[PDB]
Structures are given as structure tokens and as C-alpha cells.
Design an enzyme around this catalytic site. Structure first.
Site, short mmCIF file in Angstrom:
data_model
loop_
_atom_site.label_atom_id
_atom_site.label_comp_id
_atom_site.label_asym_id
_atom_site.label_seq_id
_atom_site.Cartn_x
_atom_site.Cartn_y
_atom_site.Cartn_z
CD1 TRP C 32 27.29 -6.31 -33.04
CD2 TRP C 32 26.48 -4.17 -33.18
NE1 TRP C 32 28.33 -5.48 -32.90
CE2 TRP C 32 27.94 -4.11 -33.13
CE3 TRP C 32 25.88 -2.95 -33.25
CZ2 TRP C 32 28.34 -2.86 -33.14
CZ3 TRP C 32 26.43 -1.70 -33.58
CH2 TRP C 32 28.11 -1.84 -33.12
CG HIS C 61 29.82 -5.88 -29.58
ND1 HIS C 61 29.62 -4.72 -30.27
CD2 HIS C 61 29.15 -6.04 -28.57
CE1 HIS C 61 28.86 -4.01 -29.43
NE2 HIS C 61 28.15 -4.63 -28.44
NE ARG C 87 27.98 -9.55 -35.55
CZ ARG C 87 28.92 -8.62 -34.90
NH1 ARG C 87 29.65 -8.74 -34.07
NH2 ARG C 87 29.36 -7.89 -36.12
CD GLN C 101 33.60 -9.07 -32.04
OE1 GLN C 101 33.23 -8.53 -33.07
NE2 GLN C 101 33.51 -8.32 -30.78
CB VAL C 144 34.86 4.10 -30.87
CG1 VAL C 144 35.18 4.12 -32.39
CG2 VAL C 144 36.16 4.06 -30.21
CB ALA C 197 38.07 0.39 -27.53
#
Ligand SMILES: N[C@@H](Cc1ccc(O)c(O)c1)C(=O)O
Ligand SMILES: N[C@@H](Cc1ccc(O)c(O)c1)C(=O)O
Ligand SMILES: N[C@@H](Cc1ccc(O)c(O)c1)C(=O)O
Lengths: 266, 785, 233, 157
Positions: C32, C61, C87, C101, C144, C197
Site C-alpha cells: 500500500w 483500500h 495509492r 474498490q 484475513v 471478506a
């Protein structure tokens, strides 16, 4: 100077019809539960409006439907597969035929919701029309059960009336559904039980009828080992409670002063 | 990470082919960006021995007498060209990739060069072209084709994600493959060690930086070129061979994700001291650049007496002075674990990224140093004839990993899968975990090397990928959502309708960057922007949008200069930044306007806008009017605030000509306002069956009086019985008070139940004559049927 | 059954990073390239409208929105969150510094990875027809685990589209939100629930769909470009 | 009886089966955005109306109408539009209208129709004099509609 409050070039502002709004919220609500919306013809055969729904000739169950019979020569009334269909012509007394229709043309499992204009030979007063709208539901597949019908209605009610809302189910009779039932919703700012529509587990003889029609069309059986639930829900009634309309006759009236009142709503 | 097929195949023999390896690594969590085939070497390239190297008098070139089966000469300008090494000899006729022309015997400074000896660049195996490829003098019998000992390789380009530092060693990868069920071959590290003291000590003054630090001792080294197989492997992985010991340290490293460095003892003095650098302390690093160290930098230093000197930049790059060369007879072998953050900082602080750092940034097996020392020492023994001590110098006592609770049932539950316990527990073992207990919940501790294994759910991913993400079924959830989640989408939906009604209205939408040019605040005459970029794309993009409209204007310019359109009606919805983040909707008009493109009459400019707008709000069902209020960025003559449902929300107007000037465009008309728009709930007004009452009469009023004040006044007094109040003619001129004006008003009345008597009309209209004349107005017209 | 909510474009590091298991000076933050903002007197409002503090940035994000949402609501729920995201990157033809997104978050008792796959399978069926199929591969995101990248198979292209990343929401995320909840005086709500997610980049997808050769067009203002889309539905 | 919700992957033939319905709703919605007011008219038609508005006769008749004026089936949307303009000129004397109806109509086959309607002064500045109205106002609103649907549009003689 240039007086800046001075009214501007008056362009036309459009609007939607009360029923359209109500139909929309309805389908929007159900499409979030995974129902897809399809339509059917307003001019139907007795086979689709009655026979395929277990409503037979000279049966005392046809009296729930005061029917307009149509005559006329040279009129292709197209069936589920676009095939030319024959049969004694009428006006839809309910949207229900659409589900025999759909079941012939598709295969389980599916969720559908079908809106439509529907007709009845009845005396136009303030809480009654001869022409009004219904919204049908049909969810068929392996495992589908009455708990899912109740679930749907519970979901409907939550969305139209908020959390303070609850639903009531009572046995009642429809030839195309058993167990059958009427359902009412509890609407808090009214402290009132709304009788909303009828419903049930689609009748064994209906599945049989469609699979039979399928064969005639050369299609394979598709409804031997599935269950289903349908519901029929009248829309003007609901629109009246929602937009606060005192008189059903207004919907078919053409009064701009009436229609215009709904430009805002969303 | 270059992953050379044949090298991996050494640890995992059973590999089917580069391609099933690509797909195999894919399921393991490793994507391959490219698969390349690398060392095409023609017939003409043979192995040869340099018998003698002879300077050519007067030149910087040498005559090489080579044993290449038969004896031949070639001329070479290569620094390293010298006797006692093996070379790659391209003979006359040879088609080399990196020269396009053919190879012949040509004549150079008096001598017929029978082909030429090759550089890594010339052969096609590396980028380097500054020297001859150098092989062991005996690697092959003289004259044999290199192909025969240097087959083509295929090398996959793998991305290795930060959670898998162990995968920065090929043996790391092999272990994964092993868990899929492939056989593993760990290299046996044969050491013939010797019991004796290390001729140097160890003093690590910074356990912070080096929580684990080991030194190995190798002496009596015969420094020389690496065997062919190592040179081949290294070249394939993107590194260039240097010799023997250096190559072994690079080879291990690439193998087990464990950077290491051999320091020549000559320069080490009494000992190695792993410590912070003294301010301004200097160091010439390997790459040959003179540098100046920062106190935060952790250095590998040596000392002698009261002398302390940096030897290398720990975990990043070794010093240049102590680098191992042909005359090195013994080394201290550094094999350590460094503080990832420190190394990271140092590395960025110096503009260095190395295989050594990187692995130290991502992290190395906290208990791997010793296994690593052995492998290296072993190799050094095998390839350089190293004698090596039994003892290591070691500092740091790192703890083993802790056990993790693991429940096959949770695993199956979390995934939706149905893997038998037995299968779960076995996969976990293949990956090298210990798993104790009998269930239902297991004690399972990972191998130190899996930095990424800490939690029970970590373990589940572990069985998932080894088992195959494909073996996970498909499914849909059913649940009654919790109440607080109801109608939670209202806002989003509200904004989408806005947009959609807007497209239907006639507006074209456009997305503008959220950035703003700080200079623009002056230009369009805005209060300054509050949010600034500590690191903009560029100065023009260095702040945050305070208004939508500047970008609208700037974008009109941008396609007048391009497609010369004759008119535009744009709208943007964007987030804007000031005090709080808020949602804005801006619109924009311009050009001729609308009518019949072949006729002449047109509607445009301000009232065209206001017209489109009061129509918009007609459809949203919101009340709309605009009053008089300047705006620095507008016309002082065409300036209004917008009032939806009685509260101010933004502005309507025509751009300021002085700005229209600076930006070089015609009169633009714009508006901007705060979202969300006020909601008005339905108050359905049952109409009236009974007929209406019509009559007209105008109002004579001063010129400057805003249409609003009058309309307002006519209305507020007109009564609790008014319908259509609207204006139908603006006349100005004779015979009115030296420049006044009359407003033509259409009026209509009506009553719900009863019907309107002429009594209740003429009265209530004269009740409007009340506050109208009693304000300074009066009627140009009166009671006109 | 996903409902759509939005979040702020100007975020705190706590929401954009810390609450998503992306810690300071961690090698996972390099995924990122971030714009850092400065500026005085700027109320950046949190999940409950409370004034939030923290080092300001631009969303890299939409992911923070799910920490956001989870603090303000309780399971089970399905949400989808669109947004503009930023970004620090070099504007070429297949890359933007500013793009969109679409996030997904489905949390509740019993939720499993089969349901994530099911969702994506459903996504693909609808964007590409029956001839379409989906591919899941392990990949790493700090917020995640098990984590994964997903690709869709698009018939008229004979191509695998890398669409987005996904996984089972990370134990440390649930922990973070329930912790924030306490600070706000709210009750824990995510001790005994699981979740999945996904993050799916939209320009990429729009490009395949409308046949747009150059991402730079989206932010461009070219009417001759925009106008080309009046028809579509 | 408990409450519950079903989960299932729908069968393929059911995919995008709602395209048509959705198509028609956008039409309506873009129409409201354009400036058109929608109105519902009975599906019945007065058999005498075929002469009046000069239509070919209606093919479907009521074996039992509400009344003779409602004894056949709508062959066109527009007659009802006209008849409804009359109906509220006689009531609320509006100065202008831009109506649209979508309804099923009956002839040979049942088909879906969209009818629109203009009338009155037109549009401009209610205090000024210049106005756009009549035929080209319509055609203008329309070629704009199709501008938005992305369809080519022209009318001939
Ligand atoms: N079609 C029925 C309502 C209905 C009952 C049961 C079931 C269903 O799907 C619909 C009616 O006209 O009142
Ligand atoms: N010795 C390595 C660099 C290196 C890596 C890791 C550590 C260290 O101290 C040094 C070289 O010459 O390329
Ligand atoms: N937010 C991530 C995508 C993502 C990954 C995993 C999960 C998720 O919900 C979203 C990105 O910027 O690429």
C-alpha cells in the site's frame, strides 16, 4: 441587475405512478431475498388461469374470481414456449397463472416474484376495484418448506414496517395450495392487522399439471421431487396504507393533481 | 525469486516438469510471473585449460595458450585471464547469442586468435562482461563441449509473499512440495571437524540487533573457482560466481533463506564485534562505494588493541577489504539472525537492497543458524578443502516456538470442508509441526522457520492449501440479519437515485480527481485548503479538493481545447474536504443553450440552469428557491444561495468574468451544494372535487426588489385557500414610475368541502391588497376575468 | 442479500492499518503506497460519529469500512462497500493512483469459506454467464487467514481474470473491533462468529466490460469519452 | 411453525431471467427524469372510440362488460391519453402537460406499448414570451430520450 429569485425556464418535471412506486419497493424488497421478477400476459386462457391451478369447471371455488370472458377472432395467445396456445380466452383474475407459465419454461430451484395488472367483474367503490395489481411469489426446489414461506413474509414485513412489526398466519383455502393460508402484518403506527395476501405450499396437482404440459411440449419432467411455496399479495391496498391514499378509484383516474403528488417519493 | 528447476529438483527429485511445478506452487500460494529457458550453448563452445598467459608487448592484451584438446592460442583483454584456470572457448564457426556476428579466427596485434574465451555475457549466462568465465582447471577433459556439463535450465520467476520468508530458500519451497506428498531430499552435511580453539573471540554489544549470532572457523582453505554445477546453479538464480567460499555462502542462502558472510581473518584482529556504528564512521562496502555510517546502523566490526573498525554493514553488505579472495587461507563465518526493523532502516537509509537484507527484513529462522553453519562448513570442506573447528562462537538463546491449540473440527467448520482428522494431522506433520495429544483439541507446535504459524486459523489455512482450495465445496449462507442492520443502505440508495434522476434530467456526469492545486484557491478565489499532501504526485496535486466546481470549470476548458463542443451540461458528485469530509453535488452549464438548432431563439445562461434545477427538485419533491448573496467566485450580478426546503445548502450562479478571464473561457454557469439533500415525507393532499376560482392582477414594484420578497408576500397574505400562484409576464417601461416594474400574477383558489363564493374571494384578495399597498406596492391590473 | 454502505475517503492509520492487522514498520505495508495528509482543525468522525484522532491518510483500500461497520452494528449481516481509494503510484495505462474498490463482508455464526467461494461463484455467473468458472489460490493478507486471490474465467476472452483478494476475516480483526467497542462503552459482539471478506477492484472490471483501453480515461473529463456510455441501460 | 430462509444455487435456465422486466423499469425511470408524467389508464376501450379516433376495430370484446363504454380491449394507448387530458382540463384547467403511459395493448397478439403526450403553451420563461412547444418540442424531448437509451432516432413522412 438580474433578479436572481425570478423564476427560471420552467421545464417539465416527470413522475412515477403510485402503483409503480409500490410495485418497485415490493420487487426491490424481494430481489434482496433473491427473487427475480418476470411478467405474464393480461389476456389468458382458462387452462392457465384456472385448470392448471386446480380450479375446475363448475366448481364452487371459481366464485372467488368474478371473471371477464373475452371473445374475438384471429388472436394468437402465445404460451410459455411461444407456442400458439388455444383455450377459452379471459382476463387474468390473478397473477397466479404466471407460475404455471414459468415452471413450464424453467427448472428448479428458483425464486420469482411476478407483478401484474389483474381483472375482476366487481363494483368500483372506494376500497374495491375491477382492475388492480397483484404481486406473486413462487419459490420451488428440493427441501423448500412452509418455514421458508413464513420466513419470506416475516422478511417482507420487517422491511415495509420496521422491527416493531410482526406477521400472522391463519389457515385458509386455495385450490392451488395446501397447506394454504392467509397472512396479515402488524403495522405499529396504525395498531392494526393488515390482511395482506394468501399463500401456501404449491399444490401437488399443480406440479403434476405443469409436468404434464411439459410432456406435451416434448420437455422432460422437472417437478417430481421438489416442493414449493407461493403467495399472492394485493398491491393497491398496500400502496393506500403507505402513501395515505383514501380512495382506490384514484389510481385509474388520470388526475394530475393526484399523480403529481408522488414526484418526490424517492 | 528466481527458482531454477534443476536446483529444486535436487531436494524434490520426483518433480514432473517445470509446468506442473508452476501449477503446484500455485496451489501452495506462490504465483509464477514467468517461466524461462536459459543456457543455450552451441557445439562450438568447448572447455579449455589456460596453460600460459603471455602479455603482448605494447598492448593491454594477453596471448592465451589453451589446451582445448589440441593446443590453440587466443588473444584476451580480460583482467582475470591468467594461467591455471578453465575457460569457455568459443571456436571458429560458433554462433553466439550475444554478438550476432559469427566467431572466427581473426588476427589481433600479431597473433591469430583461434576464436575467443568467453565472458558470462558473451556465453549468455549472466550480465557480467568484465572478465572471463573462470572454471576449475580440471572441471572437464580438455576440448569437451560445455553443453555436456552445462545443460539448458528452466527457471521460474516466483513471487514470495512476506508471510513466507522460509520460501526465500529453495529448500523452503521443497518442504511445501513435500507436504503435497513429494519426496524430500535434505542435503547431508558431512563434517570432519577438529577439536581446537577459535583464534578470535566474539563480543556482541547489541543483542537488540543480533538476538542470535554465530561464527564458524574454517582454515587451510584452497580458494579457487566453484565446480561447474554450482556456477550453473548460481547463474540461474541471478547471481554471479566469485569463487569457492563466496559462492558457497551465496549457494546456502538461496538454499535455506539464510544470508551469511565469510570474513578473511587477516582483517579481523582479536575479534568480531557486532555493534552499532560510531557517528561518521566510514566503510568501503563490497560494491566498491565509500560510505559514511549512521549510529543506528548495526555493523560487523573487528578490533585490534584499542582499535575498532567496521568490517561489513551487518545483514546488508560486507566490507570490501575483508572479502574472500584467492590468497585467503582462513575465515570467520558469520551466520546470524538480525533485527528486521533495524536492517530495514539501515537498508533504506543507504539505498541498498540485497539478497542478504530482504531476507533479514522478511525474517529468518531464529534457530537455523547452526544447521546453516554446518551446511556451509561442510561445503567449504568439500569444495575448498577447509579444515574446520568443532566449536562455533554463539551468542543468543532463542526460545523454541510455542504450541498452538488446534481442532480438526474447527478446521472443517471454518472451511466448510469435511477432511478426516487423520488427514489433517498428517499434513500438519509433513510440514514439520509436532502434534501432541489425542483430540479433540491438539497441542501442535510449528517448526522454527514458519514465522507465519502462530494461531489456530493459521494451521487451518495450512491444511486447506495442502489439501487444495479446490477441495472446498461451494455454498450459500441463510440467516435473518440482525435488526441494527435494517435499511442500513438508505443513504447509499438515496445518492444513486440523485445521480439517476440527474441523467434523466439531462445532466452529464464526470469524475474529477480529489486533489486540488493549492494555487487554485487564489485563482477561483476560495478559502485555503485544510488538508495537504506530505507527498503529492506533484505540486498541482498537493492538496485536497475543497470544492467540486473548480474541477468542473477546469474540465470544460480541457475539452474546449480538444473537441470544441458547442455546449455542455455537466454534473459531478464527489467527496470534498474542509472541517469535515462532506458529499457534494456540483453542476455546470455553458454555450448557446437549447432550442431549434436551425432557428435562432434560445434558452440558456442563468435561468436555463435555474430552470433545469427547479425541475430537479420538482422531481425530488423538494421546495426550491435562490436568493441574493455574493460569492467570491461568482458574478456580483449573478449570485445566489440555494435554499432547498428553507435551509441554505450551497450556491447558484454565473462564473466571475475576472476568472473567466484568467482561465480564458466564455460565461459558464454553475452550482454547488451539500449532500445529503433534505428529505420531505409525503403529506398526501386529498384534492378538491369542487371547482376553482380564477382571477388576475399584477403588482407594481421597485426595480431592485427580488422576485422572492413579492411572491412571498403575495402568498403569505393571499390566504389559507390559495392554489396556483405563478408569474406570467415581466413588463418594464412606460407608463410606470420612472423605471419601476409590474409583475403579472396568475391566481387560483379553491375549497375542499364547500365551494368558493365570490365573497370569500374578493375579500381575501383585498386582504392581500392590505400588506401589499401597506408595504409600497399597488396594482397595475385588477380583477381581470 | 448484501446491503451497500460507504466510508470516508480521508481515514486514520488506525482504521486503514492497525485495526486490519497491518502494523507499523511491517513489511506488509509495502502493498500500500500511501498518501499521508497534514492539516489542522479537521474533525475526522468515527463509527459512532465520535471525534476520532490518529495520523491522517487517504484510504489505500476500502477495507477499513468493515472495521468501521462492525463497530456500529451486530452480526449477522451482509455488506458490500464501494469507494474511491488512493495509492502513490505512477499513472500509466493499466494503473491509477486513484481508482475504485468494492468490498464484501459477511459475518455471523456458522459462516465458512464455502460461502466465500459461493459468493464469488455467484459473482462470476452473473458477470460472465454459465460458461464461467472461478479459481481460488492461497495468498497473503494480514486481515484475513485463510487468505486467497480469486480469478474468474471469461469465455469470450479465453482468459483468467485476477479479480480480487479474499478470505476468512482474521481473528485479530474481530478482536480489534470488540476492543474499540469497549472503549466506546459498547458490548462485545464478535467473540463467537466467523466471517469472510473480499476486495475487488472495479476499473479493471469496467475495462473488460465496456472495452476501455486506458484507465486514465476514467479521470479525464473527455465528454467524447463519457458520452459513449449514455446508452448502457 | 418456525421461521427460516432457504439457501440454494438457482438453476441455470433461471439466470438473468429478469432482464426484460428491468429493461422496462429503466425506461419508466429515465422517463421521469426526462420530464414525463406517467398515468395509468383502464385496459378497456369504448367500441365507439374506434370510429372517433379513427382506429381499426378492436379484436377482443367483453362477453360481459362493466358497461358498453368498457366493452372492448384497448388497441392503442393514446386514445386514453387524449381522453384523460380532456378529463382534467374540465377539472383543474392546467396550462400544459407532458404525460406518458406504458400499458399492454390488444391486437393479433398482446404487446407492450409506450405512449406520450404534449400540450399547451410549452416551455420557457413564464414571465417572458418566447416558447418552445408543439411538435418539435415533443420530437426534442424524444431524440433526447433516445440519446440516453443510446438508440438512433428519426421520424419520416
Ligand atoms: N392469486 C391469489 C393469491 C394467492 C393465493 C395463494 C398463493 C398465491 O401464490 C397467491 C389471489 O388472486 O388472491
Ligand atoms: N557477504 C555477502 C553479503 C552479506 C550478506 C549477509 C550478511 C552479511 O554480513 C554480508 C556478500 O558479499 O555479497
Ligand atoms: N482491500 C484489499 C482487498 C481485500 C483483500 C482481502 C479481503 C478483502 O475483503 C479485501 C485491497 O486493497 O486489495
Amino acid at each position: 441587475r438580474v433578479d436572481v429569485s425570478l423564476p427560471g425556464a420552467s421545464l417539465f418535471s416527470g413522475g412515477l405512478h403510485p402503483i409503480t412506486l409500490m410495485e418497485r419497493e415490493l420487487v426491490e424488497i424481494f430481489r434482496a431475498l433473491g427473487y427475480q421478477a418476470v411478467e405474464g400476459p393480461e389476456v389468458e386462457s382458462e387452462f392457465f388461469n384456472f385448470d392448471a391451478l386446480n380450479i375446475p369447471e363448475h366448481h364452487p371455488a371459481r366464485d372467488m374470481w368474478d371473471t371477464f370472458w373475452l371473445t374475438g377472432e384471429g388472436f394468437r395467445l402465445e404460451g410459455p414456449l411461444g407456442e400458439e396456445v388455444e383455450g377459452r380466452l379471459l382476463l387474468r383474475t390473478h397473477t397466479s397463472p404466471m407460475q404455471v407459465r414459468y415452471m413450464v419454461a424453467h427448472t428448479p430451484p428458483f425464486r420469482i416474484v411476478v407483478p401484474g395488472r389483474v381483472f375482476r367483474f366487481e363494483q368500483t367503490d372506494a376500497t374495491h376495484e375491477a382492475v388492480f395489481h397483484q404481486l406473486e411469489g413462487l419459490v420451488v426446489g428440493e427441501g423448500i418448506a412452509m418455514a421458508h414461506l413464513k420466513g419470506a413474509i416475516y422478511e417482507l414485513a420487517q422491511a415495509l414496517f420496521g422491527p416493531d412489526s410482526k406477521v400472522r398466519f391463519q389457515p385458509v383455502y386455495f385450490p392451488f395450495v395446501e397447506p394454504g393460508a392467509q397472512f396479515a402484518v402488524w403495522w405499529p403506527e396504525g395498531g392494526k392487522w393488515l390482511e395482506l395476501g394468501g399463500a401456501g405450499m404449491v399444490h401437488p396437482k399443480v406440479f403434476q399439471a405443469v409436468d404434464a404440459y411439459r410432456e406435451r411440449l416434448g420437455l422432460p419432467p422437472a417437478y417430481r421431487g421438489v416442493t414449493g411455496f407461493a403467495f399472492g399479495l394485493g398491491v393497491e391496498r398496500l400502496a393506500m396504507l403507505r402513501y395515505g391514499i383514501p380512495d382506490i378509484r384514484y389510481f385509474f383516474g388520470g388526475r394530475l393533481k393526484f399523480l403529481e403528488q408522488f414526484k418526490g417519493v424517492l | 525469486m528466481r527458482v531454477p528447476f534443476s536446483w529444486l529438483k535436487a531436494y524434490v527429485p520426483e518433480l514432473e516438469s517445470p509446468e506442473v511445478l508452476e501449477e503446484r506452487l500455485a496451489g501452495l500460494g506462490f504465483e509464477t510471473d514467468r517461466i524461462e529457458r536459459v543456457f543455450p550453448i552451441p557445439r562450438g563452445v568447448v572447455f579449455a585449460r589456460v596453460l600460459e598467459a603471455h602479455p603482448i608487448p605494447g598492448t593491454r592484451l594477453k596471448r592465451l595458450v589453451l589446451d582445448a584438446g589440441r593446443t590453440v592460442e587466443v588473444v584476451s583483454g580480460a583482467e582475470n585471464a591468467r594461467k591455471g584456470i578453465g575457460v569457455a572457448l568459443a571456436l571458429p564457426g560458433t554462433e553466439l547469442p550475444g554478438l550476432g556476428q559469427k566467431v572466427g579466427e581473426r588476427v589481433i596485434q600479431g597473433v591469430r586468435s583461434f576464436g575467443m574465451a568467453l565472458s558470462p555475457r558473451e556465453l549468455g549466462v549472466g550480465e557480467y562482461g568484465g572478465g572471463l568465465l573462470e572454471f576449475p582447471e580440471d572441471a572437464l577433459p580438455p576440448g569437451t563441449p560445455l553443453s555436456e556439463a552445462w545443460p539448458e535450465e528452466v527457471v521460474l520467476d516466483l513471487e514470495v509473499t512476506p508471510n513466507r520468508p522460509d520460501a526465500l530458500g529453495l529448500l523452503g519451497l521443497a518442504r511445501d512440495l513435500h507436504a503435497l506428498g513429494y519426496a524430500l531430499v535434505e542435503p547431508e552435511a558431512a563434517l570432519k571437524a577438529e577439536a581446537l580453539p577459535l583464534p578470535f573471540a566474539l563480543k556482541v554489544e547489541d543483542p537488540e540487533g543480533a538476538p542470535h549470532f554465530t561464527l564458524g572457523y574454517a582454515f587451510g582453505l584452497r580458494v579457487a573457482p566453484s565446480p561447474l554445477w554450482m556456477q550453473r546453479a548460481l547463474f540461474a538464480a541471478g547471481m554471479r560466481p566469485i569463487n569457492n567460499v563466496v559462492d558457497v555462502t551465496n549457494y546456502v542462502m538461496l538454499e535455506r533463506a539464510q544470508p551469511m558472510h565469510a570474513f578473511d581473518l587477516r582483517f579481523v584482529g582479536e575479534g568480531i564485534a557486532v555493534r552499532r556504528a560510531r557517528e561518521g564512521e566510514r566503510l568501503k562496502t563490497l560494491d566498491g562505494v565509500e560510505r559514511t555510517l549512521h549510529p543506528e546502523d548495526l555493523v560487523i566490526a573487528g578490533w585490534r588493541g584499542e582499535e575498532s573498525f567496521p568490517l561489513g554493514l551487518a545483514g546488508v553488505m560486507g566490507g570490501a577489504e575483508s572479502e574472500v579472495r584467492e590468497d585467503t587461507e582462513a575465515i570467520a563465518l558469520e551466520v546470524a539472525c538480525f533485527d528486521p526493523v533495524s536492517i530495514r532502516k539501515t537498508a533504506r537509509r543507504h539505498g541498498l537492497r540485497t539478497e542478504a537484507s530482504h531476507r533479514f527484513e522478511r525474517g529468518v529462522d531464529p534457530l537455523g543458524q547452526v544447521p546453516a553453519q554446518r551446511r556451509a562448513l561442510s561445503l567449504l570442506q568439500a569444495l575448498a578443502g577447509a579444515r574446520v573447528a568443532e566449536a562455533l562462537l554463539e551468542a543468543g538463546s532463542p526460545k523454541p516456538p510455542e504450541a498452538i491449540p488446534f481442532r480438526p473440527e474447527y478446521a472443517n467448520r471454518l472451511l466448510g470442508t469435511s477432511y478426516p482428522e487423520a488427514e489433517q494431522i498428517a499434513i500438519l506433520k509433513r510440514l514439520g509441526c509436532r502434534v501432541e495429544g489425542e483430540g479433540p483439541t491438539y497441542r501442535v507446535t510449528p517448526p522454527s522457520h514458519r514465522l507465519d504459524l502462530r494461531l489456530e486459523e493459521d494451521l487451518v489455512e495450512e491444511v486447506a492449501r495442502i489439501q487444495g482450495y479446490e477441495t472446498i465445496p461451494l455454498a450459500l449462507p441463510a440467516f435473518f440479519p440482525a435488526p441494527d442492520n435494517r435499511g442500513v443502505e438508505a443513504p447509499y440508495r438515496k445518492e444513486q437515485r440523485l445521480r439517476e434522476v440527474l441523467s434523466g434530467l439531462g445532466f452529464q456526469e464526470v469524475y474529477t480527481y480529489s486533489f486540488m492545486d493549492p494555487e487554485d484557491a487564489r485563482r477561483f478565489r476560495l478559502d485555503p485548503p485544510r488538508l495537504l499532501l506530505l507527498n503529492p504526485l506533484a505540486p498541482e496535486k498537493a492538496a485536497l479538493r475543497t470544492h467540486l466546481f473548480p474541477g468542473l470549470v477546469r474540465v470544460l476548458k480541457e475539452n474546449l481545447d480538444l473537441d470544441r463542443p458547442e455546449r455542455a451540461l455537466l454534473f459531478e458528485v464527489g467527496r470534498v474536504f474542509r472541517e469535515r469530509e462532506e458529499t457534494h453535488l456540483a453542476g455546470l452549464l455553458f454555450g448557446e443553450g437549447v432550442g431549434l438548432p436551425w432557428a435562432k431563439e434560445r434558452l440558456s445562461g442563468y435561468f436555463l440552469l435555474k430552470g433545469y434545477l427547479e425541475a430537479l427538485f420538482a422531481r425530488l419533491g423538494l421546495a426550491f428557491r435562490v436568493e441574493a448573496q455574493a460569492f467570491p467566485f461568482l458574478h456580483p450580478g449573478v449570485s445566489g444561495r440555494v435554499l432547498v426546503e428553507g435551509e441554505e445548502v450551497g450556491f447558484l450562479g454565473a462564473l466571475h468574468p475576472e476568472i473567466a478571464q484568467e482561465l480564458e473561457l466564455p460565461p459558464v454557469h454553475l452550482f454547488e451544494l451539500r449532500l445529503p439533500l433534505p428529505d420531505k415525507p409525503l403529506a398526501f393532499q386529498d384534492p378538491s372535487r369542487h371547482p376553482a376560482a380564477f382571477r388576475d392582477l399584477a403588482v407594481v414594484v421597485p426595480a431592485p426588489t427580488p422576485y422572492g420578497e413579492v411572491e412571498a408576500l403575495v402568498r403569505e397574505a393571499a390566504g389559507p385557500y390559495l392554489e396556483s400562484l405563478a408569474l406570467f409576464d415581466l413588463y418594464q417601461g412606460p407608463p410606470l414610475p420612472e423605471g419601476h416594474k409590474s409583475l403579472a400574477f396568475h391566481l387560483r383558489f379553491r375549497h375542499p368541502k364547500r365551494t368558493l363564493r365570490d365573497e370569500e374571494v374578493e375579500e381575501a384578495v383585498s386582504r392581500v391588497a392590505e400588506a401589499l399597498r401597506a408595504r409600497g406596492f399597488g396594482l397595475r391590473g385588477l380583477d381581470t376575468p
